[PDB]
Ligand binder design. Structure first.
Ligand SMILES: [Zn+2]
Lengths: 105, 203, 50, 119, 86, 122, 53
RNA sequence: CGCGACCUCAGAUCAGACGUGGCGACCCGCUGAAUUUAAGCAUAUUAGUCAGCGGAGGAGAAGAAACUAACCAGGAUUCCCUCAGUAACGGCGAGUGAACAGGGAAGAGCCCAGCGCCGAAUCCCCGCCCCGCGGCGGGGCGCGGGACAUGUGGCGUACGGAA
């Protein structure tokens, strides 16, 4: 029942949400586990970079941003061909390669 | 090659030759049992495209599945509840009849493993499919690296979990905007993720 | 019933053998918390509804 | 040129072979666990048993339920080097089989009881 | 008549001891247990009876093989070897 | 007085069987004495005789099964008792060589393009 | 004789092939080679039979 | 009036292996309501939820676009924040309700049929010898069999490939 100018709201608590409540008491343990796994991988690849393969320069769609530059999925085949790098050898050397990227500009 | 000619011949089903062949095959299959092992594939090109290989350990079963929809499993009336669910007659099953045939073949052949299946004929009341089955414990399959993935226990009863080609379609999963569901593991996974209340430590 | 089967007779024999009381020297053990059988069945009541 | 005398077509009798396994399923046969010592547990020394022994020239023994009259007779003959006239078996309401072993008249049941140790 | 008089003529029994679950549920006329479903290959169990499901579970009995399986897994599932003799 | 596996291991099968028969005779006499009362000294020896019988039977069975598995050592087909029983799912894994088998294309790819050891910023 | 189902099926299938109006693309295989020409062709191909194991 | 091949089809306590059932917290595929809300109630809501059935693993499913976007474009799948209680659905009432992009955790790509080239160059089983055999392999010797030309193997698959 409304009472003297309250906001009209519709809580989405009509299902059995208490059975599907997801707690986060394992967040610090999960962070510790991820940190340990990352350190283990870094020790596994002793001279290789911890982050991993190189990522290309990529711009953003959705003109909302239109200016930000981020890391790409992988280097394009035309880029590899211009640089004189074989696509299969790039994977073994540590260059991220994806075969779906286009090159308009 | 002969395989492309056979493929075009099977694509031209409305022709007189293919009509006669389909009618004769349908009559012969209807004169047989509902589940009998074919020794050789009716459609070699379709079997090859689906993954059948002419080597020891590969089995093919022809399954006849009764046509029609699925009426509600209830007594004469007695569909107690709101009139939304009173519908009994004009009801359709979720999975396809090809998936049903694959399920029946896999259930009958517990030792074998279902790979795929194809359509070979259809009557007014019966549909005919051939299901390819592989023996997971045959040496010709186990020693071959390409076809040994079925030997792992993960792929037990693919048709029951809907991992075959026929059962995959019924799940309604894919990429893009056209589905927007099963965007997690499956429809149930997406429902669970979207209807789980994420209560953080610090809120 | 005087026309019992072998399984029924064996079951009755086991239930008869289980009915005896506790030996007295049991209570003389160090960590003993047992005073009486507490599982004895009389034929008159608790009719063992086979 | 073989005419069908009967309108029925029975399934023809085909050749069937015996078992010729490449390896036995079990390495060695299981040893028998119903030997002459295991079959006979102990004789009864009750007053009724002693009266039966001294009157009917018989003996009373406790035997496993799985034993037969032939097994009991053979076991008694093997163990006590005696000849058995007959065997009468019953099952007490406890789980142990009682066996009255009636001996041949040539041998003395009281002497056999003295030898085995019960009196 | 329907009460004390009718309770007098309870002379013949319908259920007997089942040989698969041990409970006195095996129905003589239907040849079915109704507690585990002896004629049926699969054990009878339902999710609407949580207490009944927990009464006979994997941990209820002896686990004469499951405990040794757990021990063998704990030590490494090894076979065909002996410790160093004296 | 005590019967030990050290002595039981080296003796012959006929000697082991004779010792087992003697132990069975002694156990039967002890049961007769127990029924007729006897004494605590006779009653206590029942467990000793039973454990001696268990030791003799254990030695006999161990020697027999060791001989059987030595005889079947090398043959392609051996009894299921002598076969290794690890677990139902574990016995149905790959042959430990079928898994290590690689396709010719996979071998060629791994040979032509092996993973390289590299560092950056130098 | 009450023949088994498979014998009955394999006979009535030939009966159906004789009865139904078979399309020419399948009927062309009823025109088979004659005996003498078949023997000559087999004799000629006997020299060119492929190498066995 | 028979014999000898092949195609379909049965018998075997034939030789060697495989599946059955249980647990089921997590997962996958089906079937699947009513209490409740709407101050009644029939669409809706509870709800692809409870119940019922089947199937595995240590995770499962999904997964490398018949994608998203309309931008100077991004680029497998999975999970967290945000988009967002938004677009949208609903006796447009109660109520229901995503996705894109962005920032992160992780990050790995690939293989067939077909098209075509190579003397079927392929695979399975049985005998002998050597190594080793408690997750039965490797090599050699067998005019010893079988499967396969109604298509096995090598190159090769959309990022082009082959000569
Ligand atoms: Zn039962």
């Amino acid at each position: 029942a409304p009472s003297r100018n309250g906001m009209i709201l519709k809580p989405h608590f009509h299902k059995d949400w208490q059975r599907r409540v997801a707690t986060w008491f394992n967040q610090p343990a999960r962070k510790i586990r991820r940190r340990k796994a990352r350190q283990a991988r870094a020790r596994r690849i002793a001279p290789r970079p911890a982050s991993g393969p190189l990522r290309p320069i990529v711009r953003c769609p959705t003109v909302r941003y239109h200016t930000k530059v981020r890391a790409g999925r992988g280097f394009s085949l035309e880029e590899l061909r211009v640089a004189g790098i074989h696509k299969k050898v790039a994977r073994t050397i540590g260059i991220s390669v994806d075969p779906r990227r286009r090159n308009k500009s | 090659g002969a395989y492309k000619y056979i493929q075009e011949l099977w694509r031209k089903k409305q022709s007189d030759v293919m009509r006669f062949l389909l009618r004769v095959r349908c009559w012969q299959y209807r004169q047989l049992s509902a589940l009998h092992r074919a020794p050789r594939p009716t459609r070699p090109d379709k079997a090859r495209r689906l993954g059948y290989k002419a080597k020891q350990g590969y089995v093919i079963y022809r399954i006849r599945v009764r046509r029609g929809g699925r009426k509600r499993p209830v007594p004469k009336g007695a569909t107690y509840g709101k009139p939304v669910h009173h519908g009994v007659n004009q009801l359709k099953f979720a999975r396809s009849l090809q998936s049903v045939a694959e399920e029946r073949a896999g259930r009958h052949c517990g030792a074998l493993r279902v790979l795929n299946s194809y359509w070979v004929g259809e009557d007014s009341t019966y549909k005919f499919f051939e299901v390819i089955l592989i023996d997971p414990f045959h040496k010709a399959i186990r020693r071959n690296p390409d076809t040994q993935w079925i030997t792992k226990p993960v792929h037990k009863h693919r048709e029951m979990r809907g991992l075959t080609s026929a059962g995959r379609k019924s799940r309604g999963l894919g990429k893009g905007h056209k589905f927007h569901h099963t965007i997690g593991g499956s429809r149930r996974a997406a429902w669970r993720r979207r209807n789980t209340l994420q209560l953080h430590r610090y809120r | 019933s005087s026309h019992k089967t072998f399984r029924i007779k064996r079951f009755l024999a086991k239930k008869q053998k289980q009915n005896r009381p506790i030996p007295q020297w049991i209570r003389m053990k160090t960590g003993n918390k047992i005073r009486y059988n507490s599982k004895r069945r009389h034929w008159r009541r608790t009719k063992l509804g086979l | 040129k073989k005419i069908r005398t009967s309108p029925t077509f029975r399934r023809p009798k085909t050749l069937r072979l015996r078992r010729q396994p490449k390896y036995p399923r079990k390495s060695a046969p299981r040893r028998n666990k119903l030997d002459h010592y295991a079959i006979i547990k102990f004789p009864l020394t009750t007053e009724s048993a002693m009266k039966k022994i001294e009157d009917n020239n018989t003996l009373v023994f406790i035997v496993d339920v799985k034993a037969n009259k032939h097994q009991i007779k053979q076991a008694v003959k093997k163990l006590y080097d005696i000849d058995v006239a007959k065997v009468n078996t019953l099952i007490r309401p406890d789980g142990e089989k009682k066996a009255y072993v009636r001996l041949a008249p040539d041998y003395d049941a009281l002497d056999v009881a003295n030898k085995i140790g019960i009196i | 008549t329907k009460g004390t008089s009718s309770f007098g003529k309870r002379r013949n029994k319908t259920h007997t001891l089942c040989r698969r679950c041990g409970s006195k549920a095996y129905h003589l006329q239907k040849s079915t247990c109704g507690k585990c479903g002896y004629p049926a290959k699969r054990k009878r169990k339902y999710n609407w009876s949580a207490k009944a499901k927990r009464r006979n579970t994997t941990g209820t009995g002896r686990m004469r093989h499951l405990k040794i399986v757990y021990r063998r897994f704990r030590h490494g599932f090894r076979e065909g070897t002996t410790p160093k003799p004296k | 007085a005590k019967i030990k596996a050290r002595d039981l291991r080296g003796k012959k099968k006929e000697e082991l069987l004779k010792q087992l028969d003697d132990l069975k005779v002694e156990l039967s006499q002890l049961r007769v004495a127990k029924v007729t009362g006897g004494a605590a000294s006779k009653l206590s020896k029942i467990r000793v005789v039973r454990k001696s019988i268990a030791r003799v039977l254990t030695v006999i069975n161990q020697t027999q099964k060791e001989n059987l598995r030595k005889f079947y050592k090398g043959k392609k087909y051996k009894p299921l008792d002598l076969r290794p029983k690890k677990t139902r799912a574990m016995r149905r894994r790959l042959n430990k060589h079928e898994e290590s088998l690689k396709t010719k294309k996979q071998q060629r790819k791994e040979r032509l393009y092996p993973l390289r050891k590299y560092a950056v910023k130098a | 004789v009450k023949w088994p189902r498979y014998i009955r099926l394999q006979r009535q299938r030939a009966i159906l092939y004789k009865r139904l109006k078979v399309p020419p693309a399948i009927n062309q295989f009823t025109q088979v080679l004659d005996r003498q020409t078949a023997t000559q062709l087999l004799k000629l191909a006997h020299k060119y039979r492929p190498e066995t194991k």
